Design a protein around this nucleic acid. Structure first.
Ligand SMILES: [Zn+2]
Ligand SMILES: [Zn+2]
Ligand SMILES: [Zn+2]
Lengths: 14, 1188, 110, 371
RNA sequence: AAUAAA
């Protein structure tokens, strides 16, 4: 009643 | 033989609650207590509703009763706290130090008051007169203490209830009555006791009296009395002023009494027939019991009752035209948690305190007689009574941390009871979930700037260059921009309303909108810039020589202003603060400064005028007061909580961390001064081994707080609850820099640098809640949980659960075969309860039950034990295999012979069902045969199975699903616990203590080695392993811990036939479970335990020299410091029955870290030592016990 | 937490029979006591006063009194004092009358 | 003549089994702080699985008033019973009769187990050590014997030249004291069987003796009216005090385990309580026996509860601090009751009487009509 | 086998 993905980022480094 | 006790998790579970003026006479607060802890809460009604923590204190004792009173001429209420064995203390809140103040302490412990009895079975109880004229306290069930009120206290006297006009023998309850010109006390007692088994010969045994107390003359006659009441009366409640009288609760009856009218009583079910001669009528439409109910008054004629099972009822007193009660009205409103107390806060608000579940705050409104409906508003977490615990491995861990030498562990415990039963998963440290890692060696500092709150740029500072990266769908480096790349940067951040970016170089300051430069200001103060701070419109920079200049954003551009600061001493560090809470009074802006001489000052930013001054800041006073060496490296003011209403101050001095919190103090001295003071906060963070170490963040997985870098990184979180949480992050290593990060691939994450040059992108795991002392997840079961075991090979958990059903038959063993009788009663009969058991599998990948993997037992079968057992198997490479074993018994009363069963199960892997990847595991039963007696305990010993069947212990051998007996021995009355190390067995008895057994494989013989010859009620047992010494650790009914040793050469052992006690310690809680782990110290292990009050503790062996060195410090701390409520730490830990006292108290030793360096050195010199050695000894124990 | 690499003092004390004293009275039963390891290796110059059992061979029937815990002979008992259900004595009633009234009879029904 | 060689049919036995109550108590104490949290037991016949042992009802000692008859145990060749005692773990009950024989009865189903001839004279005394290792008995001829749990005799010697009435052990049970009809009390060394002291001064027969739980003190009761009760120092053998508690023969003298109280029974139909710290005045007088009081026994779990027996066959229950009896039965036995013994759990009581009979009693069940 | 069926 009442009771309370991986490696998806790429680095384009110059 | 020596050890130190430490507390790892504070207890949870409330037992008392009230509503009084704790801080001042303008507002009332909710005050709750349980065991050794006290809390004060506030109601924040504009957040919905939410309970907000305001203060918390701990004592060296367990609270037995609680009350409050308003004295004469006072600005506050005073609390009356009772402690075991007749101790009474009066305490009050102290404004000025933000602490507790002790007003009085009374002792009534002379042996002449006990009348020759040694065992005390009565708890002290405190009652307060409604008009505040006096207080009463009943001790040992026979003596009444009276405290008159006007100094504010008058001398007290003792009344003996056995020498009254009548003789009072077995007091049930006592209350003060409303009205009357003198304090009048009503007492329920039972001169001739009886019990439900002998009702047919002794029926009406309860009586009641009322005595009027004359304080001045010390005389007290009897003015009202009744004699014939039902034998099953439980409690009484005083009706408020307009009606008066008293309401008496019985198990099957309800009564209303008054001085000038005949009594009125009703019956609630049909079990009153033949059990009482009191004239009662039938209440139509009601079938209940009031044996363990809680009640309180909502109005002058309405009451709220919480039944056992959680049902909520509203009771109305129906009166005539002359305020005379003539009827009752019952209404069934709702169902809620099982409670221990309740109190009304405001019109329409209720609080239900719980020890077996979560405490709730309700809200009731009248529906449009009167009817009400209830609704939940807030809840307080409680991990309940910890009955059993298991240690296992987390299901998920990122691949970057899978080569760590240290193991990764977690704890699963059984909590709650009945409809509130659950499983709690507990972790201590935070493990980040790495998304991506990059290798960028050569960087020292980094920042993220917002370019609708997603970060747009990442700035990295090298030795002589700066790298700029855009953070969008892909992270790319920029080679041309308005930024500066030829030299290192000092600071980067956002100015304005997140519309501009400010970059600070050692030669000047730059203002940027996007990648386009707007303005540049060369800065030549005579020394290079070393630090910069940024407020909302304000920017303040400081040179290396201590020169300070300020910039303002004017409609935009930056304008220069020179602060009028004196030059009596050089400035070393500074910080800026923006206040949105209104506590800083004399949005506003402020500045904090630290000088070389050792003074701290606070100024107003638009006009640099002084408002605060501390004379000896670096030493670390416990309270900072306005007065208008160690080296300080950094300061920071932040505001946390809800709507940024809790300012805090963090200081980095030498190799120590100081934490302060601000509280208002409106002193009437001076003019134009800040009305704030600061109080020190205890912690256990070690900095022992310009880049900022404190880094504020908001909105990381919905949390705000401060990250602390260094050798031991920590998280600091404050939510709308208002409690401070400190969570370590020891995985990986020391952290160099840290920054928040909000990206499409990293939603609400963060960044940090490893010390190996690796940049990691991470998010917080989402299956735990961090608003708790430890991160925790609760899995409701809606039934009682008894045992839990972890299967290593299958990586799943087995839980034995029970649920209740009505009873319908009575077994009999009169004939050759068992016979049953059907119960036949009327329609107002209350049925007895019957329990049914089951075993189910839980998966750690998703904390849910595996379908079609349930085992159901027989009708009257109870599970008495369930363990993971390693048995011999000729199919592995080690010769052992893991199984789950259980023992059962059939309960059918005292007149039927009890027999048991042994179950051995395995967990296998099968082909998963379509659309169900969780059904790849199932049980497999190998042995389910019945034995010639009840099975009470199970264990394993060197590949064999050990069982306690009746008053014997057997060893078995398993081969092709068959158990073969090998040996047996006779034992004591009842064995309920067994543990084994190598080829030795330790067995525990219900009433006859412990014993030690040995097994010889060559001759197949079981023999007794030694035993304890004195009585003891044992709760649980385990081992202690230091290097080569083996000790036996025992729990007690009197809440003690003892260590036993086997010493054949000692003269007191009589040749080795008796076990000798070697250590002693009184913990104020019951312990039912133990486990061990190695130190994080060559061959030593740590023994952990969980208490029935929801806490966690541990014992750690220590060397003799260190123990003797720390004992002097413990004695000095005991004798030279004040303690809350005036209690004595040394007496609390003394054994309750000679004691041997070979265990240190780690909670008292923590007070040495709370002192300032001056008093630390003063105390160290008094015992002829050095603070450095003491600090090393105290920090080593903290280092070696960092598990989970 | 493994303890397989630790040699406790308890094990050494038990193996070396430290603190053992002769029995106070002659004729005491050594029931529930360990087996003397020294006696099996031509040692234990203690005679009949040893607190531990000296084991003699040529025993093949389980002692029924020892099962009830009422054996008086002790070391001089000529029946096996081990828990072996295959060497139990034959049932008297099943062998003299042809039937047994005990459903859980532990004696051999041949 | 019985030799265990006669064919018999299968029989169902009445029993009182304590295991379900212990299991229920173990389950209850996990989530209950104390008896304050314990739910009530209704007086109805359907509430049979709600019972707990006396250790779970510390606030209501009235649960242990055992007035429900269970069984009568009698020998084939019957003779008056003098001593009854329980085995230290409650596995068996041992009976000492006037023929010098011991009889053993099963503790769960009270049926015959074994019998043996122990003495050539009536058995008068029987006690167990505090370490549960030794049993000591004495007979009308003045002999003392040492026994083990398997009922094997290892030592025998003569202590007095006349009848011995009682014996008791020291706290470390290395010494023990005896009383005899010759009017003396003697102290012995257990391991050497060596006499150490002789205590004289009663002037008549000595009927009872007791040793203090911890302090090393000995109390004796005699038939002489001038010296009814005396206190002795075992180390030196000197007398300490004299108590004129009763005007008739003193039959029993027992010390509570708390170390404060002394219980006395006499032939003037009275039982009395004393505080050994202050012997100036009496504490309580228990009236209600219509004839002489001949036996007492403190409850093993409840501090203030005890039971008494009478020469007319009565059996009453008392509590310290209460004026009248809390229960009893007028005709439990025929003839005089000689001894009483509580089960170690405290839920069963045994009696031994002059009518050649031993009986067992237990707690009343909820819903009993008691008629 | 010393009372396994008392
Ligand atoms: Zn030997
Ligand atoms: Zn034998
Ligand atoms: Zn048979």
């Amino acid at each position: 009643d009442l009771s309370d993905i991986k490696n998806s980022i790429k680095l384009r480094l110059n | 033989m020596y050890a130190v006790y430490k507390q790892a998790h504070p207890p949870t579970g409330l037992e008392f609650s009230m509503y009084c003026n704790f801080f001042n006479n303008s507002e009332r607060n909710l005050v709750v207590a349980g065991t050794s802890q006290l809390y004060v809460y506030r109601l924040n009604r504009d957040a919905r509703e939410k309970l907000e923590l305001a203060a918390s204190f701990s004592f060296f004792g367990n609270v037995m009763s609680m009350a409050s009173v308003q004295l004469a001429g006072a600005k506050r209420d005073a609390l009356l706290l009772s402690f075991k064995d007749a101790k009474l203390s009066v305490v009050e809140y102290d404004p000025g130090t933000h602490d507790l103040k002790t007003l009085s302490l009374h002792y009534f412990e002379e042996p002449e008051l006990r009348d020759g009895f040694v065992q005390n079975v009565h708890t002290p109880r405190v009652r307060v007169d409604p008009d505040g004229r006096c207080a009463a306290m009943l001790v040992y069930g026979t003596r009444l203490v009276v405290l008159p009120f006007r100094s504010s206290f008058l001398p007290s006297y003792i009344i003996d209830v056995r020498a009254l006009d009548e003789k009072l023998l077995n007091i049930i309850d006592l209350q003060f009555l409303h009205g009357y010109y003198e304090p009048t006390l009503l007492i329920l007692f039972e001169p001739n006791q009886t019990w439900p088994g002998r009702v047919a010969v002794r029926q009406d045994t309860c009586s009641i009296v009322a005595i009027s107390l004359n304080i001045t003359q010390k005389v007290h006659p009897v003015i009202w009395s009744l004699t014939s009441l039902p034998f099953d009366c439980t409690q009484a409640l005083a009706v408020p002023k307009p009606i008066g009288g008293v309401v008496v609760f019985a198990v099957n009856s309800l009564l209303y009494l008054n001085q000038s009218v005949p009594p009125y009583g009703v019956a609630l079910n049909s079990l009153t027939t033949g059990t009482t001669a009191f004239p009662l009528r039938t209440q139509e439409g009601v079938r209940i019991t009031l044996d363990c109910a809680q009640a309180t008054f909502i109005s002058y004629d309405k009451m709220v009752i919480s039944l056992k099972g959680g049902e909520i009822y509203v009771l109305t007193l129906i009166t005539d035209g002359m305020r005379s009660v003539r009827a009752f009205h019952f209404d069934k409103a709702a169902a809620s948690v099982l409670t221990t107390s309740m109190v009304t806060m405001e019109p329409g608000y209720l609080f239900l305190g719980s020890r077996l579940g979560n405490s709730l705050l309700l809200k009731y409104t009248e529906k449009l007689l009167a009817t009400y409906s209830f609704e939940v508003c807030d809840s307080i977490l409680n991990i309940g009574p910890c009955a059993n615990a298991a240690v296992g491995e987390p299901a998920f861990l990122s691949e970057e941390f899978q080569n760590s030498p240290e193991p990764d562990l977690e704890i699963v415990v059984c909590s709650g009871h009945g409809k509130n039963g659950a499983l709690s998963v507990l972790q201590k440290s935070i493990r980040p979930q790495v998304v991506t890692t990059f290798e960028l060696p050569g960087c020292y500092d980094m920042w993220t700037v917002i370019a609708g709150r997603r970060h747009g740029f990442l700035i990295l500072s090298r030795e002589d260059s700066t790298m700029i990266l855009q953070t969008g769908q892909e992270i790319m480096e920029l080679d041309t921009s308005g930024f500066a790349t030829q030299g290192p940067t000092v600071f980067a951040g956002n100015i304005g309303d997140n519309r501009y970016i400010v970059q600070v170089s050692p030669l000047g300051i730059r203002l940027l909108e996007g990648v386009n430069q707007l303005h540049f200001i060369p800065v030549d103060l005579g020394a290079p810039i070393v630090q910069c701070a940024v407020a909302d419109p304000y920017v303040v920079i400081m040179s290396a020589e201590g020169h300070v200049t300020m910039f303002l954003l004017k409609s935009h551009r930056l304008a220069l202003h020179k602060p009028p600061l004196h030059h009596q001493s050089k400035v070393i560090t500074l910080c800026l603060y923006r206040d949105l809470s209104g506590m800083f009074t004399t949005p506003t802006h402020w500045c904090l400064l630290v000088r070389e001489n050792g003074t701290m000052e606070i100024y107003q930013l638009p006009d640099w005028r002084l408002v605060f001054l501390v004379k000896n800041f670096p030493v670390g006073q416990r309270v900072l007061v306005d007065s208008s060496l160690p080296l300080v490296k950094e300061v920071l003011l932040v505001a946390l909580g809800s709507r940024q209403s809790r300012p805090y101050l963090l200081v980095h001095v030498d190799q120590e961390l100081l934490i302060y919190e601000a509280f208002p103090h409106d002193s009437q001295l001076g003019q134009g001064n800040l009305k704030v003071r600061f109080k020190k906060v205890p912690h256990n963070i070690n900095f022992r081994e310009r880049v900022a170490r404190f880094r504020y963040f908001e909105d990381i997985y919905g949390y705000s707080g401060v990250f602390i870098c260094g050798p031991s990184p920590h998280w600091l979180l404050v939510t709308g609850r208002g409690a401070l949480r400190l969570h370590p992050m020891a995985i990986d290593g020391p952290v160099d820099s840290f920054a928040p990060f909000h990206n499409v691939n990293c939603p609400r994450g963060f960044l940090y640098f490893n010390r190996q040059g690796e940049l990691r992108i991470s998010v917080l795991p989402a299956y735990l809640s961090y608003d708790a002392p430890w991160p925790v997840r609760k899995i409701p079961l809606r039934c009682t949980a008894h045992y839990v075991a972890y299967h290593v090979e299958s990586k799943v958990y087995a839980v034995a659960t029970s649920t209740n059903t009505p009873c319908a038959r009575i077994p009999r063993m009169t004939g050759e075969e068992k016979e049953f009788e059907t119960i036949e009663r009327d329609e107002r009969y209350i049925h007895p309860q019957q329990e049914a058991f089951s075993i189910q599998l839980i998966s750690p990948v998703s904390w849910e039950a595996i379908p079609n993997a349930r085992i159901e037992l027989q009708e009257w079968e109870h599970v008495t034990c369930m363990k993971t057992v390693s048995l011999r198997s000729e199919e592995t490479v080690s010769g052992l295999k893991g199984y789950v074993a259980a023992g059962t018994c059939l309960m059918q009363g005292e007149e039927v012979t009890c027999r048991g069963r042994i179950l051995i199960m395995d967990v296998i892997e099968v082909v998963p069902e379509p659309g169900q990847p969780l059904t790849k595991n199932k049980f497999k039963v190998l042995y389910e045969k019945e034995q010639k007696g009840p099975v009470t305990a199970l264990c394993h010993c060197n590949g064999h199975l050990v069982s306690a069947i009746g008053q014997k212990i057997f060893l078995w051998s398993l081969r092709a699903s068959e158990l073969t007996g090998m040996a047996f021995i006779d034992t004591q009355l009842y064995i309920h616990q067994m543990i084994s190390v190598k080829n030795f067995i330790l067995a525990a008895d219900v009433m006859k203590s412990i014993s030690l057994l040995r097994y010889q494989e060559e001759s197949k013989t079981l023999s007794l080695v030694s035993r304890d010859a004195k009585p003891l009620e044992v709760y649980s047992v385990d081992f202690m392993v230091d290097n080569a010494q083996l000790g036996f650790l025992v729990s007690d009914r009197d809440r003690n811990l003892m260590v036993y040793m086997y010493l054949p050469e000692a003269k007191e052992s009589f040749g080795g036939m008796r076990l000798l006690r070697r250590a002693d310690f009184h913990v104020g809680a019951h312990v039912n479970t133990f486990w061990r782990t190695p130190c994080r110290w060559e061959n030593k292990h740590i023994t952990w335990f969980a208490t029935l009050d929801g806490g966690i503790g541990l014992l750690l062996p220590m060397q003799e020299k260190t123990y003797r060195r720390l004992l002097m410090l413990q004695n000095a701390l005991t004798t030279m410091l004040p303690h809350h409520a005036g209690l004595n730490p040394r007496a609390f830990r003394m054994l309750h029955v000679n004691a041997v006292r070979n265990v240190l108290d780690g909670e008292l030793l923590n007070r040495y870290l709370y002192l300032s360096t001056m008093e630390r050195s003063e105390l160290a010199k008094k015992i002829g030592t050095t603070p450095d050695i003491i600090l090393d000894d105290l920090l080593e124990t903290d280092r070696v016990t960092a598990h989970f | 937490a493994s303890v397989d690499h630790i040699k406790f003092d308890l094990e050494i004390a038990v193996e070396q029979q430290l603190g053992a004293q002769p029995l106070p009275f002659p004729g005491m039963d050594k029931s529930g006591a360990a087996v003397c390891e020294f006696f099996l290796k031509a040692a234990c110059g203690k005679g009949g006063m040893c607190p531990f059992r000296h084991i003699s061979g040529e025993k093949t029937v389980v002692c029924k009194h020892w099962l009830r815990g009422l054996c008086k002979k002790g070391d001089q008992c000529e029946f096996l004092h081990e828990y072996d259900m295959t060497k139990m004595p034959e049932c008297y009633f099943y062998s003299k009358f042809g039937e047994c009234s005990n459903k859980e009879c532990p004696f051999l029904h041949i | 003549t019985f030799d265990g060689k006669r064919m018999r049919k299968a029989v169902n036995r009445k029993t009182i089994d304590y295991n379900p109550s212990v299991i229920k108590y173990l389950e209850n104490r996990i989530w209950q702080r104390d008896q304050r949290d314990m739910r009530a037991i209704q007086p109805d016949a359907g509430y049979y699985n709600d019972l707990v042992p006396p250790i779970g009802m510390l606030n209501n000692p009235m649960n242990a008033v055992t007035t429900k008859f269970v069984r009568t145990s009698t020998n084939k060749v019957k003779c008056p019973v003098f001593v009854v005692r329980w085995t230290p773990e409650g596995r068996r009950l041992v009976t000492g009769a006037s023929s010098g024989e011991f009889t053993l009865w099963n503790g769960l189903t009270f049926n015959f187990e074994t019998i043996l001839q122990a003495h050539d004279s009536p058995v008068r005394a029987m006690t167990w050590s505090h370490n549960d290792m030794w049993m000591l008995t004495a007979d009308h001829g003045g002999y003392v014997k040492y026994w083990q749990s398997n009922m094997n005799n290892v030592k025998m010697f003569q202590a007095h030249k006349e009848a011995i009435r009682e014996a008791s052990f020291s706290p470390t049970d290395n010494k023990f004291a005896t009383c005899s009809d010759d009017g003396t009390v003697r102290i012995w060394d257990f391991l050497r069987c060596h006499e150490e002291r002789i205590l004289r001064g009663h002037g008549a027969d000595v009927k009872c003796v007791d040793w203090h739980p911890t302090k090393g003190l000995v109390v004796s009761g005699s038939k002489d009216s001038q010296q009814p009760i005396k206190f002795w120092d075992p180390k030196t053998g000197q007398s300490l005090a004299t108590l004129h508690a009763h005007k008739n023969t003193v039959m029993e003298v027992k010390l509570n385990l708390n170390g404060n109280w002394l219980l006395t029974a006499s032939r003037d139909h009275l039982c009395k309580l004393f505080d050994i710290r202050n012997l100036k005045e009496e504490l309580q007088v228990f009236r209600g026996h219509k004839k002489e009081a001949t036996a007492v026994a403190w409850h093993p779990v409840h501090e203030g509860l005890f039971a008494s027996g009478g020469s007319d066959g009565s059996l009453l229950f008392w509590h310290v601090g209460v004026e009248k009896e809390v229960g009893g039965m007028e005709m439990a036995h025929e003839g005089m009751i000689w001894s009483l013994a509580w089960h170690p759990l405290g839920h069963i009581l045994c009696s031994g009487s002059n009518d050649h009979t031993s009986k067992f009693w237990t707690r009343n069940r909820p819903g009993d009509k008691m008629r």
